[model samples]
Target: VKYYTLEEIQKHKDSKSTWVILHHKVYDLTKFLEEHPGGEEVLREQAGGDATENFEDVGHSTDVRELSKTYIIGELHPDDRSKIA
Candidate 1:
């Protein structure tokens, strides 16, 4: 798997190229934005930042977890990983 630095991930934040980090994993949400259950703005608010806390707080369903696999592109750099979540 690939690893991405925080700076690299931050560059992708935008309506046209959104990305988020969840539990140290990187997900490219550019294409998945429109299909999100909560609406694009919710994800957009998290774009280019760590969304693990928000994601787990909502209690995403198994199906949602499975669906998230489709967008996963890589992981966060080891030093950037959060131990709490």
Candidate 2:
């Protein structure tokens, strides 16, 4: 696993790939973008940053949470922890 800073996650979209942070964990959702039942833009609009707000809304559920972990590649660095909270 890798430790990614908030700023580091932000650049992922402009380059390539997509990332979203939730519960302090980081997930790369590039491939899953097309598979999101809500629609790709739903995830794309929140790409490259924390998606906790949306995910915590009606957007999340037990299945979604566990489904998300399958894509987890790392966590946010301790240095950027406070910023997201």
Candidate 3:
């Protein structure tokens, strides 16, 4: 699996290129903003940060979890993994 530092992910926090970390995995949600059922605002709020808690709270369906795979771009470095939880 590809590894991405928190600093690396933070650089993409913007409307043109947004990314978020969930369970140590990084996901690029740039193109997904428009199609998101919860809308872009919610995602923007957590951009470039660990959104794992929020994501789990929402109880994403199996289909949504599967859909997220398309955007699985990288992961947090091992040393920084504990920072999210």
Candidate 4:
């Protein structure tokens, strides 16, 4: 895997909220909290700083993949990529 410097990552910066996963154990998409179609509260409850660990099976779908490119790589834990905290 390629480790990107902060500057390199920032080059693709989109919105401040896009970095919601950074330094967080669960990515709380709280900023888009209202735009949710499937009900936002469910998302709020499950929204830890890093939900990726619990749901690794939920691979990035094509739509997600396309969307993710808009966001910069967040602050992943130095020791583990999967273990955010």
Among these predictions, the greatest lDDT belongs to 3
Q: Point out where model 4 deviates above 4 Å.
A: 1-28, 53-60, 68-73, 80-85
lDDT value for model 2: 0.72
How well is each residue in 1-85 modelled by candidate 3, as lDDT tens digits? 7677787778878878787788778788878878788768788678877777788889888687688777678777877877765
| Root-mean-square deviation per candidate | 2.2, 2.0, 1.5, 7.8
Off by over 4 Å in 1: 82-85
Model 2, runs deviating above 4 Å? none
Clashes of each: 0, 0, 0, 7
Task: Name the better of 2 and 4 by lDDT.
Answer: 2
Alpha-carbon RMSD, candidate 2: 2.0
Output the worst ten-in-a-row residue range by lDDT, candidate 3.
76-85
Per-prediction TM-score to the true structure, in the order listed = 0.83, 0.80, 0.84, 0.38
Candidate 2 local lDDT, 1-85, one digit each (tens): 7787877777766315677777788777777777777666667567766677787885576687678556676887977967766
Q: What residue pairs are clashing in model 3?
A: none
Model 4, residue 7: distance off in Å is 24
Q: Which candidate, 2 or 3, would have the higher lDDT against the true structure?
A: 3
After best superposition, candidate 3 residue 59: deviation in angstroms?
1.1
Model 1 accuracy (lDDT, Cα):
0.77
**Candidate 4 per-residue lDDT over residues 2-54, each given as its tens digit:** 45333333332333232233433223344554654534444433343344543
Residue 7 alpha-carbon offset, candidate 1, angstroms: 0.6
Query: How do these models rank on TM-score, best leading?
Result: 3, 1, 2, 4
